[PDB]
């Protein structure tokens, strides 16, 4: 993953990316989802958007990291992809995870 080039963002928070290989953990969780371009800066521990509060709240004690890449070829039509939806209205903020 680290040596790939299609990835647009690869910042890591608790662990440096150069020495990811030599570290053993109990479990690895991969959360996958699609968002828009301007909204990708909100996936970090501590944010105040509509995705960090109503869709994908992250804990402040985060240790993995986030990998985002543009996919305009797969998810696009000359009309629109109305199959991707987001939570716009809620009554309270989501708890982490």
């Amino acid at each position, epitope marked *: 993953l680290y040596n790939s080039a299609s990835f647009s963002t690869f910042k890591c928070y608790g662990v440096s990316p150069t020495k990811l290989n030599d570290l053993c953990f109990t479990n690895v969780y991969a959360d996958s989802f699609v968002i828009r371009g301007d909204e990708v800066r909100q996936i970090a521990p501590g944010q*105040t*958007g*509509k995705i960090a*509060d109503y869709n994908y709240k992250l804990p402040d004690d985060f240790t993995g990291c986030v990998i985002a890449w543009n996919s305009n070829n797969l998810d696009s039509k000359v009309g629109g992809n109305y199959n991707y939806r987001y939570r*716009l209205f809620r*009554k*309270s903020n989501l708890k982490p995870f």
Partner: antibody
Amino acid sequence: EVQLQQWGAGLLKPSETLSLTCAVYGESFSGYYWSWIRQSPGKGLEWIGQINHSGNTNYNPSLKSRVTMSVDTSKNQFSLKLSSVTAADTAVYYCARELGHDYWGQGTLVTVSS
Amino acid sequence: EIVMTQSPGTLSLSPGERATLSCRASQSISSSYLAWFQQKPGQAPRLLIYGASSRAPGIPDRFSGSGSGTDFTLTISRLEPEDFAVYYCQQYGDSPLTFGGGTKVDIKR
């Protein structure tokens, strides 16, 4: 029916802090979002942010770095703070419920000049 | 930030006529979540039409709305003397609420 009554200072020197308060009567204060809307003669209607009784805040990304919002549940009030105010912040401020569509405050005029 | 742009700000027409106001969004509006607000001098704006088609409770039947995609319009069947005010758009189908520029209506003579 909801009746909204607002107050706050109107004259501010540059680089001061703006504070406004709005009070809610008539219906429940919990389980709702209360919003602040700004109207300028040179820009138009603008949405600043909103807060609910639990303390959760939604902010406009343009003003997110200068806007703070507070709620006092005991007396059913919510307040707006806008720091480092400038002469571009002269406008009429309304307190409304949720997106609007039902009820608005009367409006407070704010003039920032040196 | 879906920027909304409206028809020419000032338009003049004699009373007892029809009025059409245009509204364009830089991007598509989800589920036709567009609202029209009316503001008179000295008062807060009042909602007239929600969902780009419906009519709010207590609103007269002479106000109608029609549109989709990125094009919407408001129609007033007959202009009573009290119908002269400023009209604004609002999109509530995205994250930050955005209002339009505003359109004024005058009295022709």
